[PDB]
Amino acid sequence: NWTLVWQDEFTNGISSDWVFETGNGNSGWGNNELQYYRRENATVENGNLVITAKRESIGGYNYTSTRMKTQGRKSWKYGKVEARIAMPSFMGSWPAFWMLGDNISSVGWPACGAIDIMEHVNTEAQTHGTIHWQDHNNTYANYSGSIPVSSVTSYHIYTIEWDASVIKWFVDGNLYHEASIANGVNGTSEFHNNFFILLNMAIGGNWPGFNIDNNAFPARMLVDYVRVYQK
Numbered sequence: 001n002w003t004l005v006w007q008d009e010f011t012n013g014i015s016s017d018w019v020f021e022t023g024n025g026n027s028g029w030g031n032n033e034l035q036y037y038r039r040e041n042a043t044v045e046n047g048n049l050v051i052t053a054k055r056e057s058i059g060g061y062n063y064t065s066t067r068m069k070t071q072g073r074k075s076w077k078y079g080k081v082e083a084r085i086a087m088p089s090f091m092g093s094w095p096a097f098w099m100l101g102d103n104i105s106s107v108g109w110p111a112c113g114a115i116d117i118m119e120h121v122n123t124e125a126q127t128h129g130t131i132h133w134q135d136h137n138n139t140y141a142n143y144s145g146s147i148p149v150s151s152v153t154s155y156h157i158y159t160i161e162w163d164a165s166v167i168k169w170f171v172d173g174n175l176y177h178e179a180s181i182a183n184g185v186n187g188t189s190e191f192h193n194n195f196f197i198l199l200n201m202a203i204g205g206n207w208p209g210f211n212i213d214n215n216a217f218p219a220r221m222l223v224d225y226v227r228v229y230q231k
């Protein structure tokens with residue numbers, strides 16, 4: 001069986017297992033993102049985490065949102081990682097539910113590896129699952145898939161299953177993307193390490209672009225729960 005080993009149901013408030021980033025990071029968190037992350041953009045309403053992105057100026061930036069991570073408190077090697085999410089859809093939006101390797105502090109990005117469980121940009125009628133890494137030739141590599149989602153603004157369940165053989169991606173239980181990590185094939189050795197969880201909503205960047213629907217603010221991403229199971 002899958003055994004639950006960690007969760008935030010956001011029933012009281014936000015678990016002390018979450019840490020919050022501040023500001024725009026290095027060149028927009030690596031992606032020329034336009035937001036300044038703050039703690040105040042995360043609230044709880046009726047058992048849901050609420051990440052509000054706002055048209056709000058601070059530190060020379062013009063948008064605020066939240067970026068929260070489980071880093072230095074909780075991390076896992078293999079398992080089922082899952083969140084029930086309702087996210088906004090507007091030009092410039094870039095919500096993400098994803099994982100980074102613990103060793104990012106030592107080896108950096110992209111050596112540490114990332115598992116994107118869910119990304120969405122703009123008003124696309126789909127969501128994406130991706131892995132990012134350094135292959136055995138030390139080249140930056142990613143492998144992505146998508147599934148049609150007509151209403152990202154309604155709750156969906158975004159899931160990975162992760163073992164020594166494979167990573168699989170699901171939306172509402174529908175398999176749509178898969179990647180072998182067996183024997184570190186294609187240089188995937190670093191996906192056999194501990195990874196922590198992140199939640200964020202970025203505004204603009206290299207992928208969503210720099211056309212921002214300024215009449216979409218404030219914008220809410222709601223997270224009913226995050227859960228990790230293991231064998």
Ligand SMILES: OC[C@H]1O[C@@H](O[C@H]2[C@H](O)[C@@H](O)[C@H](O[C@H]3[C@H](O)[C@@H](O)[C@H](O[C@@H]4[C@@H](O)[C@@H](O)O[C@H](CO)[C@H]4O)O[C@@H]3CO)O[C@@H]2CO)[C@H](O)[C@@H](O)[C@@H]1O
Pocket residue numbers: 026027029030031095096098108109114115116119132
């Ligand atoms: O600290 C030493 C040097 O750091 C350099 O800044 C780095 C930073 O170290 C590192 O964390 C960052 O990695 C990010 C990367 O740039 C960015 O592209 C990536 O975007 C994510 C996607 O890849 C994907 O996984 O989906 C998520 C969510 O949508 C994206 O956020 O995320 C990486 C981790 O945040 O790289 C930047 C460099 O631009 C800096 O160069 C140097 O001066 C420092 O000395």
Ligand SMILES: [Ca+2]
Pocket residue numbers: 009010011047048223224225
């Ligand atoms: Ca909840």
